[PDB]
């Protein structure tokens, strides 16, 4: 009865967003927006282009003012579900956004009639990623954190906090001039955003940028952190990521443990090719690293502490923190009380801070001929399981528990030769995983224990999800065994 696949014709897919509330999926495609049921049933379709456009011109694109306007396709740049609306940002018209009714994709709520430079949100070029994070203000108001990667005018701050629904709704998607990360030489740093996410009272960003502190000026992986309430980016701090000592320098994808939202960040990294492309085919390798978010916070906190009170030196020895992006600021010898008084900083504290000391992780998975593009991690019966996507449109399933090499328990083709989107998202019950490539979307079950009819078959075909439920006479997940005697396939040791 329900579709098992979604293959839209005459388009390529960019983004996927799941509505936690209703289960509804939204799809960002070239000149199209789709609304699907949790069962992949097509519910609504909206056209987004082509449009008369030019990156040199400002919206509304007027032919008399922009004679070089030519029909342009509109790949989806950003697609996020907020309590009130569906947030939609395209590659076209300077990365302007809109708000659509959730469940009624056709219904437009807000699309500013005559927008200004302060409302150009997303990267106005496909080929360049944009990241987003829907959060709340102190009053519960909806905020959108944006990671706009550098586009060759696009002199827009790399990270911003824009209001989704302010007093004047015509002023939506604008940041308060203060709520941004001012970087003076964006062309030189060349940001490449991967993911944006939250934990506690903080928004975090995963990205590549050139490490201009190094004579090499080579691209490096970084984790970034700002307080959710901080409207001046005072609390902003950067940490270099290492996996393992930069052998796999380029971060590709990351996800946190979900079954709800863990405390560990799982990040797929690929080794670099001679813009920051990962070495392709058998010449390049990938690795999966785990960075517990407390370790992230410990280091950011000690980067802040050093920079605030002990001139970024930090006893005993020394030179652990500094001011990044060439900003005319320096680390300080401020009172100790500053740490407690100003956790998210102030007008007097040094900003933007960054660590000299990187956050180091050793891989748990090291795949020599594979180029990882997507990460999704879940937890079944306390055991950590990872669903990883690659450049060839494969989906590998990896048990990541005690004493296991990064080897996959299964590998399947989603779409030969088409990279799996970073947008790997489970369903409400964690029974399925939505797996998207550039031309298809599949509702992939997390297990098929059911397929094995006897105990012999159930244990012979090792899946961490599966075991033999004795009292039920069925091959199942532990949760389905009712807690009774359940013969786990990864730990058989008799007696059937
Ligand atoms: C990084 O530094 C920040 C402070 O700048 C640390 O935040 C403080 O962490 C403590 C530890 O839990 C928080 O205390 C607890 O708050 C909970 C919330 O209700 C309460 O139930 C506990 O009984 C306890 O009071 C404190 O509120 C928090 N303050 C702020 C401003 O966040 C953070 O924990 C440090 N992280 C690491 C990894 O070191």
User: What is the 3 state secondary structure string of the chain?
Assistant: CCCCEECCCCCCEEEEEECCCCCCEEEEECCEEEEECCCCCEEEEEECCCEEECCCCCCCCCCCCCCCCEEECCCEEEEEECCCEEEEEECCHHHCEEEEECCEEEEEEECCCCCCHHHCCCCCCCCCCEEEEEEECCCCCEEEEEEECCCCCCCCCCEEEEECCCCCHHHCCCEEEEEECCCCCHHHHCCEEEEEEEECCEEEEEEEEECCCCCCCCEEEEEEEEECCCCCCCCCEEEEEECCCCCCCEEEEEEECECCCCCEEEEEEECECCCCCECCHHHCCEEEEEEEHHHHHHHHHHHHHHHHHCCCCCCCCCCCEEECCCCCCCCCCCCCCHHHHCCCCCCCCCCCEEECCCEECCCCEEECCCCEEEEEEEEECCEEEEEEEECCCEEEEEECCCCCCCCCCEEEECCCCCCCCCCCEECCCCCEEEEECCCCEEEEECCCHHHCCCHHHHHHCCCCCCEEECCCCEEECHHHCCCCCEEECCCCCCCC
Q: For residue 267, how far is its CA from the centre of ligand 1 (angstroms)?
A: 25
* Cis-peptide into 318, omega within 30 deg: yes
* Bridging pattern class, strands 353-355 and 237-242: parallel
Burial 356-366 (b: 16+ CB within 10 A, else e): ebbbbbebbbb
CB 297 less than 6 A from any atom of ligand 1: yes
* Cis-peptide into 485, omega within 30 deg: no
For residues 372 and 44, give the distance between their C-alpha atoms in angstroms, rounded to a whole number.
Answer: 32
Resolution for the entry shown, Å: 3.0
Experimental determination technique: X-ray
CB 298 less than 6 A from any atom of ligand 1: yes
For residues 174 and 112, give the distance between their C-alpha atoms in angstroms, rounded to a whole number.
Answer: 11
Q: Which of 470, 496, 465 is nearest to 482 (CA)?
A: 470
Q: Which ligand 1 atom sits closest to the C-alpha of 296?
A: 38
For residues 13 and 19, give the distance between their C-alpha atoms in angstroms, rounded to a whole number.
Answer: 18
Give the chain's domains with CATH numbers.
Answer: 1-448 (2.130.10.10), 449-496 (3.30.1680.10)
Show contacts of 31-35: CB within 8 Å, 24+ apart: 31/73, 31/74, 32/8, 33/76, 33/79, 33/88, 33/100, 33/105, 34/6, 34/8, 34/105, 35/103, 35/105
Q: Which of 44, 40, 45, 43 is nearest to 5 (CA)?
A: 40
For residues 342 and 335, give the distance between their C-alpha atoms in angstroms, rounded to a whole number.
Answer: 11
Q: Which ligand 1 atom sits closest to the C-alpha of 343?
A: 5
Please name the residue that has the structure tokens 């030489």.
Answer: 185
CB 292 less than 6 A from any atom of ligand 1: no
Phi, psi of 119 (to 5 degrees): -110, 5
Choose which residue among 291, 296, 300, 343 to substitute to test ligand 1 binding: the one with the highest number of ligand atoms within 8 A of its C-beta: 343
Please name the residue that has the structure tokens 């927008």.
Answer: 115
Question: Which strands, in side-by-side order, build the sheet including 383-390?
Answer: 372-380, 383-390, 394-399, 410-413
Q: For residue 300, how far is its CA from the centre of ligand 1 (angstroms)?
A: 13
């Amino acid at each position: 009865l329900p579709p098992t696949a979604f293959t839209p014709n005459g388009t390529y897919l960019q983004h996927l967003a799941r509505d936690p509330t209703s289960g509804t999926l939204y799809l960002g495609a070239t000149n199209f927006l789709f609304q699907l049921s949790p069962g992949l049933q097509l519910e609504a379709t909206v056209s987004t282009g082509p449009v008369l456009d030019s990156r040199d011109c400002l919206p509304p694109v007027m032919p008399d003012e922009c004679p070089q306007a030519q029909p342009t396709n509109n790949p989806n740049q950003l697609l996020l579900v907020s309590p009130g609306a569906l947030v939609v940002c395209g590659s076209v018209h300077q990365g302007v956004c809109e708000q659509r009714r959730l469940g009624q994709l056709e219904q437009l709520l807000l699309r500013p009639e005559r927008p200004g430079d302060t409302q150009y949100v997303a990267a106005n070029d496909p080929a360049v990623s944009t990241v987003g994070l829907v959060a709340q203000g102190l009053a519960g108001e909806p905020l959108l954190f944006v990671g706009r990667g550098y586009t060759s005018g696009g002199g827009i701050p790399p990270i911003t906090t824009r209001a989704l629904w302010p007093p004047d709704p015509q002023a939506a998607f604008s940041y308060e001039e203060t709520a941004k990360l001012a970087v003076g030489r964006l062309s030189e740093y060349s940001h490449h955003f991967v993911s944006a996410f939250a934990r506690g009272a903080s928004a975090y960003f995963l990205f590549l940028r050139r490490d201009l502190q190094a004579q090499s000026r080579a691209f490096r992986a970084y984790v970034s952190r700002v307080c959710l309430r901080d409207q001046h980016y005072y609390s902003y701090v950067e940490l270099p990521l290492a996996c393992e000592g930069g052998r796999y320098g380029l971060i590709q994808a990351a996800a946190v443990a979900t079954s709800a939202h863990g405390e560990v960040l799982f990040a797929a990294f690929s080794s670099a090719a001679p813009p920051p492309s990962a070495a392709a085919g058998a010449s390049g390798a990938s690795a999966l690293c785990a960075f517990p978010l407390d370790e992230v916070d410990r280091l950011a906190n000690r980067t802040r502490d050093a920079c605030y009170t002990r001139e970024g030196r930090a006893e005993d020895g020394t030179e652990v923190a500094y001011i990044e992006y060439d900003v005319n600021s320096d680390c300080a010898q401020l009172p100790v009380d500053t740490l407690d008084a100003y956790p998210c900083g102030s007008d007097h504290t040094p900003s933007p801070m960054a660590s000299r000391v990187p956050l180091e992780a050793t891989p748990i998975l090291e795949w020599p001929g594979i180029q990882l593009t997507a990460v999704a991690v879940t937890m079944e019966d306390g055991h950590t399981i990872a669903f990883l996507g690659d450049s060839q449109g494969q989906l590998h399933r990896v048990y990541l528990g005690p004493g296991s090499d990064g080897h996959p328990y299964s590998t399947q083709s989603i779409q030969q030769g088409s990279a799996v989107s970073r947008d790997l998202t489970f369903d409400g019950t964690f029974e399925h995983l939505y797996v998207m490539t550039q031309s298809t979307l599949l509702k992939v079950p997390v297990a098929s224990c059911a397929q094995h009819l006897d105990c012999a078959s159930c244990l012979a075909h090792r899946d961490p999800y599966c075991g033999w439920c004795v009292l039920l006479g069925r091959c199942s997940r532990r949760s389905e065994c009712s807690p009774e005697q359940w013969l786990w396939s990864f730990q058989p040791e008799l007696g059937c």
